[PDB]
């Protein structure tokens, strides 16, 4: 039971600085500094001769999956 997150401001009112301690992070280094503005005897011999659904697991894509990777 987490039951509540941490409100940000209890970090933000801490008196290290307005800034952090003075740690310089690599992702906070400068970059992208310029903003961009928009302007027949053999045949007779035998006996038997002559949708998109909204569910993952009941789909056609899923049963072709389980037919290939469970062999």
């Amino acid at each position: 039971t987490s039951h509540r997150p941490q409100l940000e401001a209890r970090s933000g009112a801490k008196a290290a600085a307005y800034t952090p301690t003075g740690i310089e992070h690599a992702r906070l280094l400068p970059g992208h500094t310029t903003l961009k503005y928009r302007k027949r005897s053999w045949r007779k011999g035998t006996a038997f001769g002559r949708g998109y659904i909204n569910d993952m697991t009941k789909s056609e894509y899923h049963q072709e999956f389980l037919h290939k990777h469970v062999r």
Partner: protein, 193 residues
């Protein structure tokens, strides 16, 4: 109220997710219908993520991409439960829709075999007989086949030690073992899972 009911509600959610994974229907008898439809909507959303992540990670394992050993192992567990759910849905539909074979196809299949066996004048296999001198030859081969699994193994759990004790009993008193087999072939029709 906000505090007392809340822990109870999240216990039904975790329980509704253990039921989806076990492929068991989740029915709480006196639960209100709008609380039931929120838990069902959110269990289906989690299940949608769970399935598509299993497909995504199974295709990485196929194409040779490097996957962790813990994540290869978690993938086989998901794809076992997904495989059984397709297998239970296949069984439920054959009960519901009936057999795919028609009665005219089953008659034709049955007579092709009778015509062949008449043509071969086949003498059909009897029951394992009362006076059969070869009975002990068949037992040696079957018991050795079962025994060779244990030729290598070092550490056995309780099921493997129980398995070897029955085979050593069948060597030590082969005539009582052979009578147990005949009693089962005549009478035993319900089996263990």
């Amino acid at each position: 109220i906000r505090q007392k009911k809340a822990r109870t509600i999240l216990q039904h959610l975790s329980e509704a997710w253990r039921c989806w994974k076990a492929n068991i229907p989740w029915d709480v008898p006196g639960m209100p219908a709008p609380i039931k439809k929120i838990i069902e909507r959110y269990i289906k959303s989690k299940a949608d993520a769970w399935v598509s992540a299993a497909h995504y990670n199974r295709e990485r394992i196929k194409r040779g991409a490097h996957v962790e050993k813990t994540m290869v192992k978690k993938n086989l567990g998901r794809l076992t439960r997904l495989w059984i759910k397709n297998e239970q849905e296949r069984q439920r539909q054959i009960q519901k829709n009936g057999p795919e074979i028609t009665p005219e196809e089953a008659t034709t299949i049955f007579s092709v075999m009778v015509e062949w066996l008449e043509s071969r004048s086949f003498s059909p296999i009897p029951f394992p007989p009362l006076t059969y001198k070869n009975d002990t030859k068949i037992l040696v081969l079957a018991l050795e086949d079962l025994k060779d699994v244990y030729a290598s193994k070092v550490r056995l759990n309780a099921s493997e030690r129980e398995e070897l004790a029955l085979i050593e009993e069948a060597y030590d008193n082969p005539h009582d073992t052979l009578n147990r087999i005949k009693k089962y072939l005549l009478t035993q029709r319900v089996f263990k899972p």
